[PDB]
Amino acid sequence: AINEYKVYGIKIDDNGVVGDEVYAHIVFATNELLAKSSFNKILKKQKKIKPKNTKVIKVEEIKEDNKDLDVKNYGIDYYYKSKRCDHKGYKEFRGVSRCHAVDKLLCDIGGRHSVKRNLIFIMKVKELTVDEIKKDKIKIFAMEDVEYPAYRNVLRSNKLFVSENEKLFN
């Protein structure tokens, strides 16, 4: 599970509201504290305001509707840190929410490249129509052309030992 938040904040010195600007940042994280942490990280690297001179005025959660659980196609732009350097790339996913899309990327890179979730950075999330799809993976499922049978058996009962003449699986 992963959530989406938008954080707002200003600069202060020995006195208040020293600049009339307000800064904003949308972030995918698990909770508000991990959200606030990211806001501090970006401010210090793109500007030079350290925490002691900042104040957060607001944090809000962003939520969709999707009462019917309709399935949508999304494209995601990302980078991650390896032992060598920083690696950029783009991949496409299907799901019922932007957060559902984002949790699947994080799982993928951990599986394929052996990276902990805190070393992955999301740059952009975009919802796409059928003509926009670039890579091969999801297109068959998007064009609604897939059926398959079950490969995994399923247990009939919670009992550990059963009679030879009973039905065992599904």
Partner 1 sequence: VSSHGYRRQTRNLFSQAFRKHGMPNTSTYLTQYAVGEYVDIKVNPAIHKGMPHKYYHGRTGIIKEVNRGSVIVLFNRILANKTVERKVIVGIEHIRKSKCQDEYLKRLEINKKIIEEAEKKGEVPVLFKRQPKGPKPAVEMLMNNIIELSYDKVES
Partner 2 sequence: SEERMQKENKIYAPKDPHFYAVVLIKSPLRASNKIKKTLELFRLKHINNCVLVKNNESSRQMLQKIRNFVAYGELKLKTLRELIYKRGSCHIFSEKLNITNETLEDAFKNIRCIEEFIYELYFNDERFKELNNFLNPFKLTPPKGGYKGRKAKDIIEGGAVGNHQDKIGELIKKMI
Binding residues for partner 1, rule: CB under 8 A, are 10, 12, 16-17, 20-25, 42-43, 46, 55, 57, 79, 85-86, 88, 121-123
Distance from C-alpha of 39 to C-alpha of 37, rounded to nearest angstrom: 5
Place of tokens 């690297």: 45
Q: In whole angstroms, how close is the CB of 118 to partner 1 at the nearest point? A: 14
Residue 54: count of CB within 10 angstroms of its CB: 16
36 is a site residue for partner 2 (CB under 8 A)? yes
Helix or strand run (H / E) with residue 42: helix 32-46
Asked if 98 is part of the footprint of partner 2 (rule: CB under 8 A), the reply reads no
Residue type, 62: I
Q: H-helix or E-strand containing 79?
A: strand 72-81
**CB under 5 to 8 A by kind: which of RNA, partner 2, partner 1, none does 134 bind?**
none
Which of residues 58 and 137 has its CB atom nearest to partner 1 in the complex? 58
Tokens of 51: 């925490």
Binding-site partner at residue 112 among partner 1, RNA, partner 2, none, CB < 5 to 8 Å by type? RNA
Distances (CA, A) of 157 to 130, 151, 160: 43, 19, 8
Q: What is the binding site for partner 2 (CB under 8 A)?
A: 8, 32-34, 36-37, 55-58
Q: What is the binding site for RNA (CB under 7 A)?
A: 87-91, 107-108, 111-113, 135
